Design an enzyme around this catalytic site. Structure first.
Site, PDB file in Angstrom:
ATOM      1  N   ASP A 383     -29.449  15.019   4.737  1.00 39.05           N
ATOM      2  CA  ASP A 383     -28.317  14.598   5.550  1.00 39.05           C
ATOM      3  C   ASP A 383     -28.078  15.666   6.604  1.00 39.05           C
ATOM      4  O   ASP A 383     -28.052  16.856   6.285  1.00 39.05           O
ATOM      5  CB  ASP A 383     -27.067  14.388   4.695  1.00 39.05           C
ATOM      6  CG  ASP A 383     -25.889  13.889   5.499  1.00 39.05           C
ATOM      7  OD1 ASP A 383     -25.668  14.392   6.618  1.00 39.05           O
ATOM      8  OD2 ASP A 383     -25.183  12.982   5.016  1.00 39.05           O
ATOM      9  N   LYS A 516      -9.299   9.485  18.092  1.00 46.68           N
ATOM     10  CA  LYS A 516     -10.598  10.038  18.432  1.00 46.68           C
ATOM     11  C   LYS A 516     -11.650   9.452  17.505  1.00 46.68           C
ATOM     12  O   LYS A 516     -11.337   8.845  16.478  1.00 46.68           O
ATOM     13  CB  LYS A 516     -10.607  11.565  18.348  1.00 46.68           C
ATOM     14  CG  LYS A 516      -9.985  12.118  17.090  1.00 46.68           C
ATOM     15  CD  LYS A 516     -10.071  13.628  17.067  1.00 46.68           C
ATOM     16  CE  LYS A 516      -9.053  14.205  16.113  1.00 46.68           C
ATOM     17  NZ  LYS A 516      -7.728  13.564  16.305  1.00 46.68           N
ATOM     18  N   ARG A 726     -26.370   7.230  13.635  1.00 48.84           N
ATOM     19  CA  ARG A 726     -25.296   6.245  13.611  1.00 48.84           C
ATOM     20  C   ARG A 726     -25.311   5.454  12.311  1.00 48.84           C
ATOM     21  O   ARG A 726     -25.079   4.242  12.314  1.00 48.84           O
ATOM     22  CB  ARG A 726     -25.414   5.300  14.806  1.00 48.84           C
ATOM     23  CG  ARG A 726     -24.691   5.785  16.049  1.00 48.84           C
ATOM     24  CD  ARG A 726     -23.185   5.773  15.864  1.00 48.84           C
ATOM     25  NE  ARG A 726     -22.530   6.673  16.805  1.00 48.84           N
ATOM     26  CZ  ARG A 726     -22.330   7.965  16.578  1.00 48.84           C
ATOM     27  NH1 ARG A 726     -22.731   8.505  15.437  1.00 48.84           N
ATOM     28  NH2 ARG A 726     -21.730   8.717  17.489  1.00 48.84           N
ATOM     29  N   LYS A 732     -26.671   4.086   4.395  1.00 46.61           N
ATOM     30  CA  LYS A 732     -27.391   5.189   3.779  1.00 46.61           C
ATOM     31  C   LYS A 732     -27.791   4.886   2.366  1.00 46.61           C
ATOM     32  O   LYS A 732     -28.325   5.759   1.679  1.00 46.61           O
ATOM     33  CB  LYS A 732     -26.546   6.461   3.818  1.00 46.61           C
ATOM     34  CG  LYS A 732     -26.365   7.043   5.206  1.00 46.61           C
ATOM     35  CD  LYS A 732     -25.510   8.297   5.173  1.00 46.61           C
ATOM     36  CE  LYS A 732     -25.528   9.000   6.516  1.00 46.61           C
ATOM     37  NZ  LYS A 732     -24.899  10.343   6.444  1.00 46.61           N
ATOM     38  N   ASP A 753     -23.990  16.168   1.115  1.00 45.23           N
ATOM     39  CA  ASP A 753     -23.013  17.244   1.239  1.00 45.23           C
ATOM     40  C   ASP A 753     -21.592  16.822   0.909  1.00 45.23           C
ATOM     41  O   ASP A 753     -20.866  17.578   0.260  1.00 45.23           O
ATOM     42  CB  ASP A 753     -23.039  17.824   2.661  1.00 45.23           C
ATOM     43  CG  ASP A 753     -22.379  16.911   3.676  1.00 45.23           C
ATOM     44  OD1 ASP A 753     -22.187  15.717   3.373  1.00 45.23           O
ATOM     45  OD2 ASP A 753     -22.047  17.386   4.780  1.00 45.23           O
TER      46      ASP A 753
END
Ligand SMILES: Nc1ncnc2c1ncn2[C@@H]1O[C@H](COP(=O)(O)OP(=O)(O)CP(=O)(O)O)[C@@H](O)[C@H]1O
Ligand SMILES: *[C@@H]1O[C@H](CO)[C@@H](O)[C@H](O[C@@H]2O[C@H](CO)[C@@H](O)[C@H](O)[C@H]2NC(C)=O)[C@H]1NC(C)=O
Ligand SMILES: *[C@@H]1O[C@H](CO)[C@@H](O)[C@H](O)[C@H]1NC(C)=O
Lengths: 1028, 324
Positions: A383, A516, A726, A732, A753
């Site tokens: 990752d 954001k 993306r 995943k 992680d």
């Protein structure tokens, strides 16, 4: 969907708080343990062969098949039993500690086991929790009390939870005052991080405050409270339904690639132990065809046995030639191969190299089974953000209105406000010595470094965030103005959407909607006419290898707010699919945002995160990468990571080439066959998107002539390094499956992680959780854990290999140990009247599989490195390639066997020719048949051992004591058992056999030779392999 | 911080033996020098041992004593001529082989009651349920019960030396000390207590086939009851069909004469043990003994076939390696 009441009295129907972590009991141990053993093939088969010996009249006394089966049990039951009893005495502690309750204005002191659902608990500082409470108030106001989940997932910081507003006033103020409430929570789900609830507190006369709940109010059972005086909770789950207790189950992964072979050998032997019987039964009733060749007047058949139905007798034999060859199935393997794992798994938790100084902790093995599954990986799904690059972000080179600020105060000043708001910084509350430090203590504690670097950024400019004071927010806008901001709704971030937001109310005016997220998911909702102005910048800042984040505000009108406000909260009280039903309430809240400016953050690589990925390649693995950041970025950090050499003809499938529905496949097949099918080798790598991917898999059901996916997958196997940008949080996972399920079963080793990766670690063959800066959501689910990425090298090669060559050469030898021990006893059913006369004694049929030759194979199992542990990690060329499971494939397996047969024959026919002499001693005396057992035995225990002393390439001081510590045992046993052990026996058949099998100087020369001629087909491979 | 113990780090004090061609090739040439000096060292002491097996089973129309191959008067009497070319020097042993006599037969190896022969008084009067087919005759206990001790080879051999005259010189045979001293004074003991070996056997009898009671196998009290060498050596099972059990050993006379002077002898066997039924032969193997044992070529031809096929590949290895 449940219901609760604070004082259990509104305005036993639930579980009881007693955590039983064990599996057995003090009564149902045996009827459970035994069964959980005798369901295993070799531990059950050996049972049948016991009964058959107790009822039928058979050659070998029941001892020689019930002891080596009653022992292998008593040594597993004890361990597997005691190793359990540790929990009982452990459990009994936790659920028998003191925890005070509040019955009626009383601070009762009960036992943690007595608690029921819906009842006020109390907790001082430093004390563990009694059960999953719902923080209702603390000694102070502000309804806050930190927590340190240092025992559930291993976290070691002080998280901060929140109480209920309408109750913070209650602290010793007799909350027992028939306090009304309705605590409805989804039936306990073990996710340990999601909690949907609600409270319906009632006022004096009437009140229906629908104070929604959330994971920020649950206090797990086992999270040591810290930095506070005391609190008051309301139990909601009461043990065995609590979130923690549900998390004892992860066993649905421990199916190694060396645990079915052990089941493909037996199925062979069980189909050889018959041929050895059938081929040796037929030959009997065909041999007995002679009329005199049976009972020739010197062994008259016992009258009874004469009058037996022939067909039946034709059975008792075939049931004898199993009880006589049953030893051809290793009886003591299901204790060694387990005793090994237990006694030999810690090695992956002690190795100092798996110990980062900073994190002040080492590796961690959360599965004692998948060890041997490390020297097998063929796909490694790393990752990008979190593993390949530590989370230490440094805000650099922002870009406001495409002006690249270094406009003045018309909109820029606003922009800064955006940076300092819309986040979860939560600056360190405590105050340190300010005046000597740079600015102050000002240590930010948050989980997403993608922003902690932003705040520190703005802190380099005028504005600076220092607040969250009493529902407000403080900032310093280049001067002395706290400028409190009233926070209204902090829309948490959600990967599937890629946008977090905040709806603040301008202290002296209207409201604002900051937000954001990744450009690809913020631009769709913007006043489009402004994109291109700043798009190019976001490209470069990405093109160079910086993280990127866009930010835009959208002023809301008050008249419009009430709609949102209502629509917002009401989208929370929903107990069913809250996160979805909530996610969708504000997914349409970010309709059109007036983009302000973009930001760029840089990242760093790890110590060897560029050297390792240069090793893995050389080890044969096909390393992938499943990032989530922009495509350009990943392509940049990749080069540095060194998985894309200078000359690699990429095959990108980004949106920049597939901006259509059908276009791709056209481009797909082209760069597959005409580009990568007609043909250093690494010239080609791949790159995909979260969108370009979904089209392929989901929409593959159209071209059934040449299905899209079936085409795409074809490229995977033939690309040494691939990327995925993306990527959503689940895609995943579809990737893993889409790979795991192709052309065999490539062992996929994924490594994550943080929370984003929980969706694959729980999905790949052997996860690897890196306990980094974000949290332990990843390292708590992963089978293993290593506080770095540079460790994934010393893990796979230096351990994954030894944890295979240390067993592959056990499940092999642990069979070849027997197929020799029981071959003679089959030949010697040729020069006897097929009357199943056990060549050996009986004292040499029990021992041999538990005592004579048990240890020497265990020793070589735990501690051994057939290649020095340094030369193995400093040279990954093939030492992770030389064993692609090949050590147990059909090739080698039937070599050992065709090594037993030969080394088996030579044992017998090597002896037979030796008894054509009429004597061997010098006094001229003769040698019985038992003296034909020890010879062809003592020549056995000296081969099946020495054949090891030609394999151990790492001679510690143990091996020296075990191997030469079994031989010099055997040569003693036969001397003792040989001598006077008469009283309780019934045969005295081996009274002095051995001691006379050694006083014949012409016998050794048969042993000292029969050994050699049996090893000579092994001393050769050494030469024929050390020569080239 | 983590335990830096010698073991847990997994780097215990090793030996690490470098097994490589350049250091293993001598492994071949080191044995070839050490076996062959034995493979030949033995092979010499094998061909320097003279033996003779006078197959006297019968079944030969011209066999000297076919006359009693069929059922005749019990005390048959054979006589076999045979000639010794090279006289025997040392003390010679006289075996009596057999063939197709499956004395290793699970139904025939269990047929001894080992705790009776040892002399366990109580066990005597009521032997086990293993020597079944020959356990009780006339509802009585048998002293050496069981097929093994029952069918005890019971014919008497004899060797005569024919001098210059026609009168044959009788060769002196010895019978004591032909069974492992270990299992001749410890594993086989008479009944618990007594003075004359008969009384001790009160309720027992002789086996079925035998002709005389066990307490009359020999006059010498040191060899009569359950101690009879002939009996003992008959109990230790054969270990193979084609076997041969020590019968009597001729002690090498102190003088410097050849214990067996060359020439022709007479072998008159009181044929009693019939084996023609199961098609089993009989013999009488005379032999010397060297430290190796009895004449046996295998050990010789084996060493010299290993001490010279290991020492050869080394050549094909030494020559092949340098040429690459
Ligand atoms: N506070 C915040 N503000 C704006 N965007 C955020 C954010 N927190 C997360 N994001 C967005 O979420 C995305 C997370 O990326 P993704 O999870 O797909 O890969 P990643 O780089 O985060 C690897 P990992 O999951 O291990 O951290 C980023 O693209 C980022 O834009
Ligand atoms: C010697 O032992 C053999 C064993 O087969 C035996 O044949 C000889 O004669 C037997 O005598 C037994 C009775 O005393 C009994 O076995 C039987 O009568 C007879 N043989 C047969 C045909 O069974 C034995 N000879 C001597 C010297 O007794
Ligand atoms: C062998 O036995 C025979 C039986 O007649 C006897 O004469 C003598 O003891 C020996 N030699 C002969 C002449 O057979």
């Amino acid at each position: 969907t449940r219901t609760v009441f604070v004082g259990n009295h509104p305005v036993q129907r639930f579980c009881d708080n007693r955590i039983v972590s064990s599996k057995y009991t003090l009564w149902n141990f045996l009827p459970k343990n035994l069964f959980e053993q005798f369901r295993r093939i070799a531990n059950f088969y050996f049972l049948i062969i016991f009964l058959v010996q107790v009822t039928v009249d058979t050659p070998t006394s029941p001892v020689t098949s019930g002891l080596p089966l009653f022992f292998v049990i008593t040594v597993t039951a004890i361990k597997q039993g005691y190793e359990d009893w540790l929990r009982h005495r452990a459990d009994n502690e936790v659920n028998k500690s003191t925890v005070y309750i509040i019955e009626n204005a009383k601070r009762v002191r009960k036992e943690s086991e007595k608690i029921k659902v819906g009842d006020v608990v109390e907790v001082q500082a430093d004390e563990t929790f009694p059960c999953d409470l719902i923080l209702l108030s603390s000694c102070t106001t502000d309804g806050t009390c930190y927590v340190t989940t240092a025992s559930l997932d291993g976290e070691s910081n002080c998280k901060t939870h929140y109480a209920v507003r309408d109750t913070i006033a209650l602290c010793t103020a007799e909350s027992i005052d028939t306090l009304r409430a309705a605590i409805e929570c989804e039936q306990p789900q073990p996710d340990l991080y999601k909690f949907v609830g609600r409270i319906n507190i009632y006022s004096n006369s009437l009140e229906a405050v629908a104070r929604s709940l959330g994971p920020e109010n649950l206090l797990l059972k086992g999270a040591t409270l810290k930095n506070t005086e005391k609190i008051y909770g309301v139990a909601v789950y009461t043990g065995m339904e609590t979130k923690m207790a549900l998390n004892y189950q992860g066993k649905s992964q421990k199916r190694s690639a060396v645990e079915k072979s052990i089941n493909a050998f037996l199925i062979v032997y069980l189909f050889i132990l018959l041929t050895k019987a059938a081929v040796c039964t037929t030959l009997k009733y065909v041999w007995q065809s002679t009329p005199y060749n049976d009972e020739p007047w010197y062994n008259q058949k016992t009258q009874k046995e004469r009058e037996t139905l022939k067909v039946l007798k034709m059975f008792t034999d075939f049931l004898s030639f199993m009880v006589l060859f049953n030893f051809i199935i290793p009886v003591s393997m299901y204790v060694t191969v387990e005793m090994q794992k237990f006694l030999g798994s810690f090695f992956i938790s002690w190795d100092k190299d798996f110990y980062d100084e900073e994190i002040n902790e080492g590796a961690l093995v959360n599965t004692s089974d998948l060890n041997e599954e490390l020297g097998q990986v063929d796909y490694v799904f790393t990752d990008k953000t979190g593993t390949l690059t530590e989370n230490s972000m440094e805000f650099i080179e922002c870009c406001i209105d495409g002006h690249k600020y270094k406009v003045d105060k018309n909109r820029e000043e606003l922009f800064l406000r955006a940076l300092c708001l819309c986040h979860t910084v939560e600056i360190k509350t405590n105050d340190a010595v300010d005046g000597a430090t740079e600015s102050a203590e000002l240590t930010y504690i948050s989980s997403s470094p993608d922003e902690i670097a932003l705040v520190k950024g703005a802190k380099r400019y005028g504005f600076t965030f220092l607040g969250n004071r009493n529902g407000y927010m403080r900032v310093e806008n280049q001067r002395k103005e706290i400028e409190e901001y009233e926070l209204l709704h902090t829309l948490n971030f959600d990967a599937v959407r890629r946008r977090m937001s905040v709806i603040v109310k301008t202290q002296e005016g209207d409201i604002l909607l900051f937000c954001k997220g990744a450009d690809s998911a913020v631009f769709p909702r913007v006043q489009n006419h402004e994109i291109e102005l700043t798009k190019v910048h976001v490209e470069r800042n990405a093109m160079d290898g910086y993280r990127t984040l866009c930010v835009a505000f959208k002023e809301i009108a008050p008249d419009d707010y009430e709609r949102i406000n209502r629509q917002l909260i009401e989208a929370k009280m929903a107990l069913q699919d809250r996160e979805e039903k909530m996610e969708k309430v504000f997914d349409d809240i970010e309709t059109n945002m007036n983009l302000i400016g973009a930001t760029a953050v840089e990242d760093k690589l790890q110590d060897q995160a560029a050297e390792t990925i240069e090793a893995l390649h050389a080890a044969g693995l096909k390393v992938w990468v499943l990032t989530g950041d922009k495509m350009e970025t990943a392509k940049s950090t990749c080069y540095a990571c060194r998985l894309f050499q200078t000359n690699t003809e990429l095959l990108e499938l980004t949106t920049k080439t597939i901006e259509e529905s059908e276009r791709k496949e056209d481009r797909l097949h082209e760069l597959l066959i005409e580009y990568r099918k007609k043909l250093e080798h690494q010239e080609y790598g791949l790159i995909i998107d979260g969108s370009t991917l979904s089209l392929i898999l989901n929409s593959s059901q159209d071209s059934s002539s040449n299905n899209y996916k079936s085409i795409f997958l074809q490229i995977c196997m033939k690309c040494t390094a691939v990327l995925c940008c993306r990527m959503a949080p689940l895609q995943k996972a579809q990737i893993v499956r889409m790979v795991k399920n192709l052309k065999g079963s490539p062992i996929t080793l994924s490594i994550g992680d943080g929370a984003n990766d929980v969706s694959m670690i729980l999905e790949s063959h052997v996860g690897i959780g890196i306990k980094g800066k974000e949290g332990r959501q990843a390292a708590r689910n992963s089978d293993y854990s290593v506080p770095k990425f540079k460790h994934l090298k010393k893990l796979l090669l230096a351990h994954g290999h030894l944890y295979y060559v240390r067993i592959a050469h056990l499940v092999q030898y642990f069979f070849y140990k027997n197929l020799c021990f029981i071959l003679p006893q089959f030949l010697y059913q040729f020069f006897c009247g097929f009357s199943q006369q056990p060549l050996y004694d009986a004292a040499y049929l029990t021992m041999y599989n538990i005592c004579f030759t048990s240890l020497p194979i265990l020793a070589y199992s735990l501690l051994e490195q057939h290649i020095n542990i340094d030369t193995l990690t400093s040279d990954p060329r093939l030492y992770m390639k030389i064993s692609g499971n090949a050590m147990l494939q059909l090739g080698p397996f039937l070599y050992w066997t065709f090594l037993a047969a030969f080394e088996g024959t030579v044992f017998f026919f090597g002896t037979y020719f030796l008894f054509q002499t009429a004597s061997l001693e010098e006094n001229g005396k003769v040698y019985g048949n038992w003296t034909f057992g020890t010879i062809v035995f003592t020549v056995l225990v000296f081969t099946v051992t020495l054949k090891l002393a030609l394999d151990t390439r790492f001679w510690t001081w143990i091996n020296h004591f075990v191997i030469w510590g079994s031989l010099a045992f055997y040569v003693f046993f036969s001397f003792f058992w040989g001598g006077i052990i008469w009283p309780f026996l019934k045969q005295q058949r081996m009274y002095f056999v051995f001691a006379q099998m050694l006083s014949s100087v012409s016998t050794w020369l048969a042993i000292i030779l029969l050994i050699f001629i049996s090893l000579f087909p092994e001393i050769l491979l050494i030469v024929l392999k050390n020569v080239r | 911080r983590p335990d830096n113990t010698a073991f847990k780090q997994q780097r215990l004090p090793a030996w690490q033996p470098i097994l490589t061609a350049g250091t293993v090739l001598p492994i071949f040439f080191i044995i070839g020098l050490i076996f062959i000096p034995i493979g030949i060292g033995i092979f010499v002491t094998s061909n320097n041992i003279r033996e003779i097996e006078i197959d006297y089973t019968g079944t030969e129309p011209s066999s000297p004593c076919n006359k009693c191959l069929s059922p005749d008067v019990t005390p048959c009497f054979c006589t076999i001529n045979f000639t010794l070319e090279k006289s025997f020097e040392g003390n010679v042993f006289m075996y009596y082989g057999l063939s197709n006599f499956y004395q290793n037969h699970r139904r025939y190896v269990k047929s001894r009651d080992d705790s009776q022969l040892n002399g366990d008084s109580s066990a005597l009067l009521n032997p086990s349920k293993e020597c079944e087919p020959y356990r009780r005759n006339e509802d009585k206990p048998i002293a050496p019960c069981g097929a093994i001790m029952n069918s005890m080879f019971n014919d008497t051999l004899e060797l005569f030396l024919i001098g210059q005259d026609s009168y044959p010189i009788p060769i002196a045979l010895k019978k004591k000390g032909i069974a492992w001293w270990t299992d001749k004074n410890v594993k086989f003991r008479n009944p618990p207590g007594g003075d004359n070996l008969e009384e001790r056997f009160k309720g027992t009898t002789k086996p079925v086939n035998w002709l005389k009671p066990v307490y009359m196998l020999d006059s010498d009290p040191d060899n009569n009851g359950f101690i009879n060498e002939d009996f003992i050596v008959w109990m230790r099972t054969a270990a193979l069909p084609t076997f041969r059990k020590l019968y009597r050993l001729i002690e090498r006379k102190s003088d410097l004469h050849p214990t067996l002077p060359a020439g022709r002898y007479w072998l008159n066997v009181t044929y009693n043990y019939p084996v023609h039924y199961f098609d089993g032969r009989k013999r009488m193997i005379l032999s010397t003994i060297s430290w190796m044992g009895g004449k046996n070529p295998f050990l010789g031809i084996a060493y010299i076939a290993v001490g010279s096929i290991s020492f050869l590949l080394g050549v094909v290895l030494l020559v092949i390696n340098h040429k690459y």
